[PDB]
């Protein structure tokens, strides 16, 4: 039995100088020293689980509804042509594409996710989640010299987007 | 181990019995009876795989090893531990082996055929080292043995 | 002979275990006599060779033993005075592995090559556990050596010849008797032969220069003879003992 | 050796020579013994190759039957011609004035 | 099984495209922000953009020696000479980053806002990862070593110096920090929510599967070794690409001798 | 109730041997390298510049090779035969000529026909007679209709450039020392950097080895050397894993304890260390820039790539404690074939650039000062070097490029003409490196990574027993790669790029490497998916039929090889429990509407190379298929290879039989062409009433062996 | 078991502390002051049964 080990060990080893709030003796909480997971970092005590994209739009859309901030991985090319620029070899891309709606997303029965893009359709894949921060930005550069910038929040999860070349080659087999 | 010794050890089983229930067969004036018997030629262990069943074949005294992934071919599951999976070759050279039974086969054969020329490597200097430090001693006529001085 | 032999398998003394190197490389290195070899098989008799549980016992008093293996939990130990590190004993595993030590055992082993320490550094506060206490490293390295310490001393020797690996009791069958006998490896005759139980005076070693450095030029010159014969049988090669009396 | 394939040769040789054919002889494949033994007997020859034979020294039968057949054989190019050689005192190395 | 449920739309904003950058810090877990703590200058060199910060942290605090502290101010800057004195009090009181470029392209990523039946997204003008700076020990260093104190042509091109002197071309521009706690978050931060109905049929997009694998995985070649007349030996159940029709029955009856038309069509295709 | 089997798969080989094969190794070798190596070869080198007098140079833009001819002495030309050259004690060779541009002080000098120097011919390449030829036109040329080809003829005496065999490059291995230390190696080689690295644990702690330096240099110096300033990272990019971390501890300990901590201060001290003929950063930072793990690629000073590399590569060091077993030193999937095309091409290199060079020298000794006018290089551009260099290694056997650094003998053999078989037999040979240097003894014998691949039953009788091979009979060796779109559809199937990442990454178990020829690519989920898209993209023909992809779930990576000199062979397809191959598609090949070319684009039938065999599951026979299965068996006698081909029955008989005959079927006495009684040969053996067998193979007629029969029926 | 100094990402090391003892960073004056008692686990492993119980 564990005490029953233990009571030698009681006997001797159980001081402690905790009670000590003076300066060579005291912590301030948020100070707290490092491990290395983000999970394990939780050292001074007073006394992963896994997720599938749908079930995480579930909870932002229902459990609590509220905006969050994302990043996503974009293939290299859309289905549609370099606007008025006629590829040169320059792929079409989301990087110069007008504001304003431009398409949906959509998941099915059992969970299947993908992404509508006009007569194609793409699937999307969730990223790697880690334990260290990210954040988003911008700067006002007013001047020549000088300017002020902004933060607008955290980043959360990451999303990779990717055709499913299984479902492009069967229109017509090669 | 202990399972691989009863492996082999039912396999040793049935080549025993397979011979055994192959000498008493054979008739007398039958050909490699007779030149096994008086001794000559052969061995009544040699009759059993010409006639009723080629053995374990065994690599250095072990079953074959694993070469690719955790299996010793293609042609054979990942883990498997199956008799025939390991090299044991049921056919008799009369029926005549079957693909991976002449592969194991061949393996085992080139291993002991790599080994006549270099069991002669070390011999050599055997042979050497010793009669140049020993072949002076010779037999005296009161009996006793010395040495050049 | 070199050329004849045919070296079979399953050489294994009936134990399927503890095989040996055989034929042309075995007497290859009998004949060079070096000094160092591999596998240096050790014999030795018991006073009785039925008394199973007492050659277990003397097999636990000759076999080498470790303070992180008679041990299931170390730990480093922080306080904010303090800092120390503790062991805690496997007691039930040492009445089951009838080892003939004490908790304060470890402390006589302690300040044997280990570096200045002294043994009012440890605090045996019990049967259960025992405790050591760092010292001021002074130079060359920072006090914060306690981690090499914590995980060197578990390492340390408390039981045992250091110089033996593994042994084991060998049973028989035979009509003449049904009994047991004690097989041990290591490459120290002298010690092994230096306790009580075992019958001595009939200890026998494998390895030529061992038993001519505790018996005798006398005695290796009969365990050349002894070890060329064992290992031609054992093929099942003819040489007659005169051709190998003389090379001895 | 255990050469079983000779054996068989001989066999399908004799087969193939009585009927006309030439029998394939592949790996893990081939002419069966338990097919070719029947094309024997249809000519008249004993199932299994092994015929009677009269000694031609003494005219008597043998006691045996013995195993007839045809078998390719090919020659090499080791001729012992070529091979023999003996010296007498012929000529000499002149660093080391041995022959 | 269909598509039965999260028809969420998708919208794009371009306003702050230019303006949007992505940093993380590797060293720094997810538990915690740096919220409460006064960033004392900023700086980027847009040209080639990497960036630089600087900011302030408490000395007062017991998880600060700040004898330690008194002792490597004293090493870090000229003990009482101050030249270039990075703290003028006696104490480090404040800390750097530096920045550290992590693709040469970021075309292909895009940020992303999550909003109730709507998507919003923007590309990334730029992402660095950031550093936390170790220069003090090399000035102190660099401190203690100072107290203890035409042309021919070359090969050089891939020079360090040369690249140093590129970078060093370009002077650092700074800004005013302000924090995620300033309303002006939330003032620019509604710019991403760009205008716009609910759902438009979009001009591009338009091409078919068939089309999009084309000419996203164009060939490789794009003009062919042999002409499809069988210089050597060439595809018969694949049709010959270009090939006539009257050669092409020439090359099929170069192989069989004779030939039923009626299975023909089989290998020209039924038109 | 069995499947029903498809009986005429056996037809599938002659198709496949009509165009691939037996001897068409060596002639496609040389014909890529004459025709589209040569080319990039002298590209690589087209302009050569002046001492003086800028704007001056001499350019080459094209170069060609012709077809063969002799000299005569009238500066007069003829065409000949391959025969003539035979008995004519002449070499068969073909002359080179440029079309070069040199300076005159005028802007130009056009040229276009000049000869620089003679290339000896491949018989029945594309640039010889015998080639294209028809069988009753043979014989003017007095040549043979069966000759195998593929060799050359130099100063009258038949010669062959032997199949070489090395091991595989740019690859990580870690191995257990004499002394039981783990260590890990690679061979970095570029076109020239065949320099090694190394790394030692031999303490407790890692270091790395180098000629470069004179002592030895633990882990987490070069690391912070590199660019990683911090410890945090270190964990990162080792792992979480805390047994992990626990043993990787103490390897850190002794780098703390000296005060270096910043990266300019490792490299001053790592400077002074350098085996030389402060200075010493850029010194070191050049040296930990361009010499060290070359291999892998990185840009101007991110040096972040690299760093992975090495974490990697540690981390397997650790998990080796854990198991100490590795991979077999010779498992085939690590080892590539050398033909005559690579060893030639690297001959050709040096030879051409010291003729540009050595041709630099005599113009700089008089072109600034030697004259009062311009000198012209036609006064010096000579071209006997190259003829002379050619054949002195094609005849001689032994070459020394001493710009690789490799002086190997033993590349060229006489052709055996003692019968039909001993020349084909030597055609298909393989030749090794050990060559009895070192006493590794375990390589002798046959692993099962040799299925199919390599004649089981073929090896020299005596000492050379396991060291000489045969190719078997139906197998290829494939071509080099320009690695152009593979990379593009990994970058688009979901790979992260690895310099974004933190480290931590790769700890987790749901994750995955993927690379590409040993160098990295990024993190990959769902492997299999990729392996499925890869599959299936190959089967249908976008991407070349002889990529491979294959995976290693232990160490949760995945293999992507497009190299060249990496043998493969082909497989039927197999799906739900069927073959894809039909009896109506075989009949048709039968009656010859569809060919091989077909099966392959119709995804009947594919090469699956050695490394990935590893992962699928074959049925040798159609009944013994069952759900698990991928592949099919075309037909199994192509096991064995051309000699072990004449022994009837071999199935029956006890291997070592099958040895000794292998070997002695290279002797018999027989016939050798139809033009023996023309060639004049230093020795000949003929029989004089040659009889075919009466029990045969069905290889000794894809051989045409029994128009050539070396026997009697007795 | 390692540990990092927040102040500056480097691992943290063990010093004579004024009062009680502390992690201090090699470098930045971040520091670290034990409060708790603490300890780490090793838990060995121990002999096999074959032999420990064969032949009592
Ligand atoms: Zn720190």
Partial sequence: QGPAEMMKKKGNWDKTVDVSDMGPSHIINIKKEKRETDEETKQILRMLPKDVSVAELLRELSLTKEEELLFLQLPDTLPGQPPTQDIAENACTLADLTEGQVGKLLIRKSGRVQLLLGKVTLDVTMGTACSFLQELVSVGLGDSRTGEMTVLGHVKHKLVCSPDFESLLDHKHR | ?149 | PGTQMTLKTFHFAGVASMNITLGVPRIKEIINASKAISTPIITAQLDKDDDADYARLVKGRIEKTLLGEISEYIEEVFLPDDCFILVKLSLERIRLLRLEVNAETVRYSICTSKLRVKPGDVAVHGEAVVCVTPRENSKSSMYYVLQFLKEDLPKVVVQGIPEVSRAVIHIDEQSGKEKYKLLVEGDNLRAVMATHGVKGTRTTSNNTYEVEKTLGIEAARTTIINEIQYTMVNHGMSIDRRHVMLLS | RMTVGKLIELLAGKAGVLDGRFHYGTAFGGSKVKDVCEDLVRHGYNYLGKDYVTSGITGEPLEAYIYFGPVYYQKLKHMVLDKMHARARGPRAVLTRQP | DDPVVQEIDVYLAKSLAEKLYLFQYPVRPASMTYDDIPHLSAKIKPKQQKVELEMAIDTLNPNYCRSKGEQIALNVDGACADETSTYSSKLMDKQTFCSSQTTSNTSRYAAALYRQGELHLTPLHGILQLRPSFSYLDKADAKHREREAEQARQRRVQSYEFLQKKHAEEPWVHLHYYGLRDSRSEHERQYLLCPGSSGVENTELVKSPSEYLMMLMPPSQEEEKDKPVAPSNVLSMAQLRTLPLADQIKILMKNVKVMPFANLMSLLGPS | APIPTVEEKWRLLPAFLKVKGLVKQHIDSFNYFINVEIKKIMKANEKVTSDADPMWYLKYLNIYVGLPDVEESFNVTRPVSPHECRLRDMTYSAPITVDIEYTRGSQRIIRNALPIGRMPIMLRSSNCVLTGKTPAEFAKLNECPLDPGGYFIVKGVEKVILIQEQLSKNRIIVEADRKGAVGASVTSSTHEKKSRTNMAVKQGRFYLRHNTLSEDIPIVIIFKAMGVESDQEIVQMIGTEEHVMAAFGPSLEECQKAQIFTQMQALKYIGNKVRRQKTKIEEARELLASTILTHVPVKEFNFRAKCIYTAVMVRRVILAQGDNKVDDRDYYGNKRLELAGQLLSLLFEDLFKKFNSEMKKIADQVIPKQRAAQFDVVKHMRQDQITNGMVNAISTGNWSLKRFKMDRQGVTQVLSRLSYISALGMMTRISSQFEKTRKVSGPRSLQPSQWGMLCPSDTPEGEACGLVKNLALMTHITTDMEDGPIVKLASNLGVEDVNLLCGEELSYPNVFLVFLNGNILGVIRDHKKLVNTFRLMRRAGYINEFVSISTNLTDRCVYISSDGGRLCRPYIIVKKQKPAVTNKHMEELAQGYRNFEDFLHESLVEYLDVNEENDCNIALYEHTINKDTTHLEIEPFTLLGVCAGLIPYPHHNQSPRNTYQCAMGKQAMGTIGYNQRNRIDTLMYLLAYPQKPMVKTKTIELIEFEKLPAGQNA | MLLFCPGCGNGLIVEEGQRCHRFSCNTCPYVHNITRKVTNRKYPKLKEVDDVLGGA
């Fill in chain 2, 1 to 149: 181990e202990t399972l691989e010794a009863l492996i082999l050890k039912e396999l040793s089983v049935i080549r025993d019995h397979a011979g055994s229930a192959c000498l008493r067969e054979l008739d007398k004036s039958n050909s490699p009876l007779t030149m096994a018997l008086c001794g000559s030629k052969g061995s009544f262990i040699n009759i059993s795989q010409m006639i009723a069943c080629v053995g374990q074949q065994a690599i250095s005294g072990s079953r074959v090893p694993d070469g690719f992934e955790n299996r010793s071919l293609p042609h054979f599951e990942k883990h498997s531990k199956l008799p025939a999976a390991k090299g044991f070759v049921a056919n008799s050279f009369y029926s005549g082996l079957t693909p991976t039974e002449f592969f194991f086969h061949t393996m085992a054969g080139r291993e002991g055929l790599v080994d006549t020329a270099v069991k002669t490597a070390e011999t050599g200097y055997m042979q050497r080292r010793l009669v140049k430090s020993l072949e002076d001693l010779c037999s005296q006529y009161d009996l006793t043995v010395r040495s050049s001085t």
